Amino acid sequence: GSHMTYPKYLLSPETIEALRKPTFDVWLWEPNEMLSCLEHMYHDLGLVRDFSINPVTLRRWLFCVHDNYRNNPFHNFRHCFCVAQMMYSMVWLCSLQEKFSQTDILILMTAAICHDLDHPGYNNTYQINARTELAVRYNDISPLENHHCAVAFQILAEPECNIFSNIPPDGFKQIRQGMITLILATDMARHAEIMDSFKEKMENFDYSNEEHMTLLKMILIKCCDISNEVRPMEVAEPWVDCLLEEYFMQSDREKSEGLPVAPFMDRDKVTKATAQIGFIKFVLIPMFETVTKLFPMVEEIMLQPLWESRDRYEELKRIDDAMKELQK
Ligand SMILES: C[C@@H]1CN(Cc2ncccn2)C[C@H]1c1nc2c(cnn2C2CCOCC2)c(=O)[nH]1
Ligand SMILES: [Mg+2]
Ligand SMILES: [Zn+2]
DSSP: OOSSOOOTTSOOHHHHHHTTSTTOOTTSOOHHHHHHHHHHHHHHTTHHHHTTOOHHHHHHHHHHHHHTSOOOSSSSHHHHHHHHHHHHHHHHHTTHHHHSOHHHHHHHHHHHHHTTTTOOSSOHHHHHHTTOHHHHHTTTSSHHHHHHHHHHHHHTTSTTTOTTTTSOHHHHHHHHHHHHHHHHTTOGGGHHHHHHHHHHHTTSOOTTOHHHHHHHHHHHHHHHHTGGGGSOHHHHHHHHHHHHHHHHHHHHHHHHHTOOOOGGGOTTTOOHHHHHHHHIIIIIHHHHHHHHTTOTTHIIIIIHHHHHHHHHHHHHHHHHHHHHHHTO
């Protein structure tokens, strides 16, 4: 809708606007356009202003982060973009700038971007069972999440990537601690533990209680991380196949190496529909239900697409099961 054509990395006013909503089609963009989107978020949220981030350093940092993501079917730079874009959408939807400080927004955004750095495409169960260098280094304690974290701080230690260079040491330590808590909280083995702790605080929630806010930030990063099904069907659906592509690579390797295989990774046991029905019903919907108690606007924007998705996979399951029965 402009008088002349601008290159892809110069985001159109329409893209800038659409970027604020969970309906944003994450598939339409090349890495350079996604990098421009992430950069806009830091300026738009007032993070460049409030933390005196050098605008060039922000770009170098984002480019370095992009480079440290692997070309995996799921755990890649586009996934990193989803999580950060969903976080950014949640800041607007939930009016997080009213409830959280700029330091908290910075932690939420930086942890969302860094949460899966250098992911190898094989989960913690593979690392542990195969006794990999990562499992040995981290003593079987969230090896991947600990690594994503370490890589995040290794990038920030490079002077041309240090977006925190103008932040006083006390501020840096505060951001570092918060980011470590958030990235480590993305380990799904801790889901029930984190959900229970949050629900316990939800009995009488306090926005001025640091412990309550830490748990809310952990729940927010967890929400964003597994949020694909909140997105429109056309955007959400291709992500399941990407994850299954990664899971099948792992189970094949586990079979070959004589290691235990998880049923949800077994090509003959798992179906996209049955895997998604369960995940939506027992992981996604209950998690977003607890958030809705604090942010009532999350029901219409995030629970409604989850209900629609659950109902569509139930339809797909009826057809898929009948189809798979003819195949034998
Ligand atoms: C098709 C996936 C099979 N999995 C079954 C399952 N059941 C119980 C426990 C674990 N998995 C649930 C499915 C699933 N996993 C997701 C999604 C998003 N992130 N993850 C994951 C969350 C974990 O970290 C990697 C991405 C999703 O939409 N579906
Ligand atoms: Mg992860
Ligand atoms: Zn992730």
